Amino acid sequence: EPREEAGALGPAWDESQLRSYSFPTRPIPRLSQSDPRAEELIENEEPVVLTDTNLVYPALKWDLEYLQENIGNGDFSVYSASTHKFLYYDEKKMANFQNFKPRSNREEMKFHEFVEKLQDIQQRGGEERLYLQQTLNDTVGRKIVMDFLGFNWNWINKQQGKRGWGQLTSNLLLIGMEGNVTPAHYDEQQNFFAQIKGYKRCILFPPDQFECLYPYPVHHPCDRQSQVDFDNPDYERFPNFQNVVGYETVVGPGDVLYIPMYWWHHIESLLNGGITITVNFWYKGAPTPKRIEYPLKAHQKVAIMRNIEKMLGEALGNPQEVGPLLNTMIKGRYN
Amino acid sequence: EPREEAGALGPAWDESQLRSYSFPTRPIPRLSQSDPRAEELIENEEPVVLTDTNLVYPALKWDLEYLQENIGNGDFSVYSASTHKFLYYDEKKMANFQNFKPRSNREEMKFHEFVEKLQDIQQRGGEERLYLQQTLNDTVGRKIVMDFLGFNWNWINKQQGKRGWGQLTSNLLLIGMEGNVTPAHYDEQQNFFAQIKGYKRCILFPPDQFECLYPYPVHHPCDRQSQVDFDNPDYERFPNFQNVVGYETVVGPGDVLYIPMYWWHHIESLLNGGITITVNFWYKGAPTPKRIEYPLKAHQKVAIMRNIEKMLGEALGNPQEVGPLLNTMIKGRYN
Ligand SMILES: O=c1c(-n2ccnn2)c[nH]n1-c1cc(N2CCOCC2)ncn1
Ligand SMILES: O=c1c(-n2ccnn2)c[nH]n1-c1cc(N2CCOCC2)ncn1
Ligand SMILES: [Zn+2]
Ligand SMILES: [Zn+2]
C-alpha cells in the first residue's frame, strides 16, 4: 500500500509504476532507527528500511540544477543502455569470454553534459536510458563537500562498530532515469542504501535462493548477476526460478535500506517517476569467527562455491575448463 | 592368441576361460626388459608386460604345500565373498555411509587353515570364494625370507631410481581361487605386478576414461572403485560406459605387468585355472615438478577432482553434503 505524502500532497506512487514479475514477494519492514526490532534485523543480517536516520539529510535538497551549480567541473562516469535493463560487467574478466557482447557502454563526461544529454533524450523520443554512477567525496565542489560532511556519520559509524564491520569501502552517488532497472545480483559487502530523490522499488532475495537465481560462472564478466531475464524467465534452463520468493519495498527520500551481505537485490526506478538520486554506503563485512560454528550460513556456502570455482580456474590454467571438469565430477557420481 | 607353453605342453589357456564383457580391448605389449620400447612405455607411464625380469624367480616354485611348510605359524588376512566379485572397502569410511552393506567379510587365520578352508570348498560345492592378501617380509618363515631376498632387487631398484619414484610402500602376496574377480579400480601408487602361479587376465583403462567408469564418491568406502557392474552395466545411470576401451593381457608365471599410477585395472583369475599366486610391488610416484607444465595430464585432473571432493567434505563438515552442493554449483550454470 503506497504511503501518503504529508500535507495531503497525494500518494507518493501507485502500483501502475511498478513492473510486473512472475514471483510472489512480501514487504520489507519500515521501522524507526530507535526501534529495537530494527537493530535485531540488522544484527541478524536481514533487510530493513529505516525511516528516520537523517543519514543524508543535507542531500535531500539535491536535484540536477543544484548538483550542476555545485558538484564541480570534474568528470563523472555515465553508463548507457538502449533498454531499461542496465547490463553491468567486469572489464577485467572479458578475456575469459570473447563471445560476450557488452550491452551497456560507459562514457566519462562533465556533469553539465550528463544533464544536457539527459535533457536531450527527454525532448526527443527516449528509448535510450542513462545512469550516473560516481564515487562521492572525490574532486567535488565545496558546497557538496559541506553536504557530504553533514551526513549522519554518528549513526552509521555506530552501526559499523556494533556489527563489527570493516571499513567504509565506497560512497557511491547514483542518478538514474525513470524506469531504469539494475537486474538482480548480489554483493559481497554490506550496504546502507540511502534514498534522496524519487522512488526505487527494491526486491531482495536471501542467499539461500542461490539455487533459484542461477548466477553466472564466477569467471564470467557478469559474475554475481542472475542469468534469469525477470521479464521473460526461461523455465526450461532455470526451472527453480518458479520457486523464487522476494522481499519487496519502495524507498523514497529520507529512507535507508539495509541490503545485507550476499542478499540478491533487483532495483528499479519507478516508471514515470522522474529521476532518482541515491547514495550507497558500502562496508566490508565483519571477519569470520575463529571457530566456524556449524551449521553454515547460506552465504558461507556461497563463499565456498565461489572459492571452488576460482580454485579450479587457477589449477586448470583456464576458466573455460571449469564447467567440463565439474560435470565430469558429478555425472553419474553425485547426481 | 594364447601362448604355447614350452616342451609342447599345450596352450597355457584358452578363450573359454575368460569372462565376457561389453567393451572392446587391445593388447598390452609383451616385451623383454632389455627392449628400449619397454623403458619408453614405463617412462611414459603406459602399461607393459615384461617377460624376463626374473623379478620373483625364487617364488616360481611356490604352491600351497610349499608355503604351508615354510611360511610360518603366523596369521594371514583372508577375504571372503559369496560371488566371484570381491567387494573391497575402506572400513575407516563406513561411518559416512551407514546404508553401505559389506559384501565381502575378512577373517584372520593361520595359513594351514586357509589351505583347509580352500580345500574344503573344493570337496564341497563352492559358490563361496576366497582371497589371501597379506603383506610380505613380515613374520615369515626363514625359507620364504630366503626366496624373498632372492627377488631381482637389482632390476626393480634401478626402475625405482630411473623413474624417480618414492619408496617401496608395500609388498603384497595374493593367493586366489579360480574365477576370482577384483573389480575395476585405480590406485594412487605405481605397481609392478609379478605373476607366480596360474593366470590372471588384466584389463586396464587409462586415467582419461574417468568419465566412462564412474568411481564412487571419494568419501564412500568404495572410493577409487568403479560403480559399474561389468557383468550387467546400467547404461541409463552410466551411459559413457558404452564408450570404454580397455588394454588387455593375460599374465602367467614369470611375467611382470606395470600398472601405472591412476590406471584403472580389472583383474580376474582364469576360470578353471586353479589357484593364482601373485606378488605386487607398490611404489610412491615421483613428486610433482616445481613448474606445473600445461596441459595437465589426465591423472592430475583426477587428483584435482579428488582434492575438491575432500575439501568440500571438510568445509561443509559433512561428506553427505558434497553432492547437493556440487549440483547447486553446476545446475543451470555450467551444464
Ligand atoms: O549500483 C548498485 C545498486 N543500486 C542502488 C540503487 N540503484 N542501484 C545496488 N548495488 N549496486 C552495485 C553497483 C556496482 N558497480 C560498481 C562499479 O561500477 C558500476 C556499479 N557493483 C555492485 N553493486
Ligand atoms: O589387490 C590388488 C590387485 N591385484 C593384483 C592381482 N590381483 N589383484 C591390484 N591392485 N590391488 C589393490 C589391493 C588393495 N588392498 C590393500 C588392502 O587390503 C585389501 C587390498 N588396494 C589397492 N589395490
Ligand atoms: Zn549491488
Ligand atoms: Zn589396485
| DSSP track, B116-164 | HHHHHHHHS----EEEEEEESSSS--HHHHHHHHTS-HHHHHHHHHHTT
User: What approach was used to elucidate this structure?
Assistant: X-ray
Which residue in chain B has the smallest CA separation from A241?
B332
Task: Round to whole Å and give the CA distance between A237 and A241.
Answer: 9
* Pairing mode of beta strands A25-27, A246-251: parallel
CA distance B114 to B120: 10
Q: Is A88 in the pocket of ligand 1 (CB under 6 A)?
A: yes
The three grid cell numbers given for residue A41, joined into one nine-digit string: 534485523
Contact by Cβ (8 Å): A87, A81: yes
Q: What is the DSSP string of A196-216?
A: EES-EEEEEE-GGGHHHH-BP
Interface check for A315 against chain B (CB to CB < 8 A): the answer is yes
Give the helix, strand, coil percentages of chain A, each rounded to 5.
Answer: 30, 25, 45
A106-110 and A75-81 strand pairing? antiparallel
Q: Which residue has the cell 596352450?
A: B11
SS3 B112: helix
Which residue from B minimizes the CA distance to A321? B334
Exposure b/e, B23-50, CB count within 10 A at least 16 = b: bebeebebbebebeebbebbeebbbbbb
Copy the grid coordinates of residue A301.
556456502
Task: Say how far residue A263 (Cα) sits from the centre of its chain.
Answer: 10
Distance from C-alpha of B233 to C-alpha of A110, rounded to nearest angstrom: 69
Supply the DSSP symbol for A179.
T
| Residue contact B329–A315, C-beta within 8 A | no
Assess contact for B90 and B106: CB atoms under 8 A: no
Amino acid identity, position A122: Q
Which chain A residues are closer than 8 Å to B211 by Cβ? Answer: 328, 331
Q: Show the domains of chain B with their CATH numbers.
A: 1-291 (2.60.120.10), 292-335 (1.10.287.1010)
CA-to-CA dists, residue B267 to B9, B53, B84, B230, angstroms = 25, 21, 11, 12
Sign of the dihedral defined by the CA atoms of residues B311, B312, B315, B317, in that order: negative
Burial class (CB in 10 A: 0-12, 13-18, 19+), B306: middle
Query: Across the interface, do B238 and A329 touch by the CB < 8 Å criterion?
Result: no
Q: DSSP state, B5? A: P
B325 in Cβ contact with A305 (< 8 Å): yes
For B214, list phi and psi in degrees, rounded to 5.
50, 65
The rounded Cα B250 to chain-centroid distance in angstroms is: 14
Q: Which residues of A touch B333 (CB under 8 A)?
A: 214-217, 227
Instruction: Give φ, ψ of A204 to 5 degrees.
Output: -110, 145
- Tell me if B240 and A332 make a contact (CB, 8 A cut-off): yes
**Of the candidates B79, B57, B76, the residue with the CA atom closest to the CA atom of residue B177:** B79
Which residue puts its alpha carbon closest to atom 22 of ligand 1?
A: A187
DSSP class of A289: P
Helix (H, G, I), strand (E, B) or coil at B201: strand
The Cα–Cα gap between B221 and A231 comes to: 48
Which residues lie across from A26 on neighbouring strands? Answer: A247
Q: What is the CA radius of gyration of chain A?
A: 21
Q: Is the CB of B39 under 6 A from ligand 2?
A: no
C-alpha cell at B157: 631398484
- CA-based nearest residue to B308, from B241, B223, B218: B218
Known binding residue A265? Answer is yes
Q: Could you tell me the three cell numbers for A168?
A: 567504509
For this experimental structure, what is the resolution in angstroms? 2.3
**Cβ atoms of A305 and B328 closer than 8 Å:** yes
Task: Report the C-alpha dihedral over residues A305, A306, A312, A314, rounded to 10 degrees.
Answer: -160
Of B220, B309, B203, the closest CA to residue B264 belongs to: B203
Which atom in ligand 2 lies closest to the alpha carbon of residue B259?
Answer: 9
For A144, the enclosing helix (H) or strand (E) is: helix A142-149
CB neighbourhood size of A201 (10 A): 21
Neighbouring C-beta atoms of residue A117, cutoff 10 Å: 16
- B291 — contact with chain A (CB < 8 Å)? no
* Residues 6 or more apart in contact with residue A299 via CB below 8 angstroms: A45, A207, A261, A262
Output the DSSP codes for A7-27: TT--BS--GGGS---SS-EEE
Burial B157-171 (b: 16+ CB within 10 A, else e): eebbeebebeebeeb
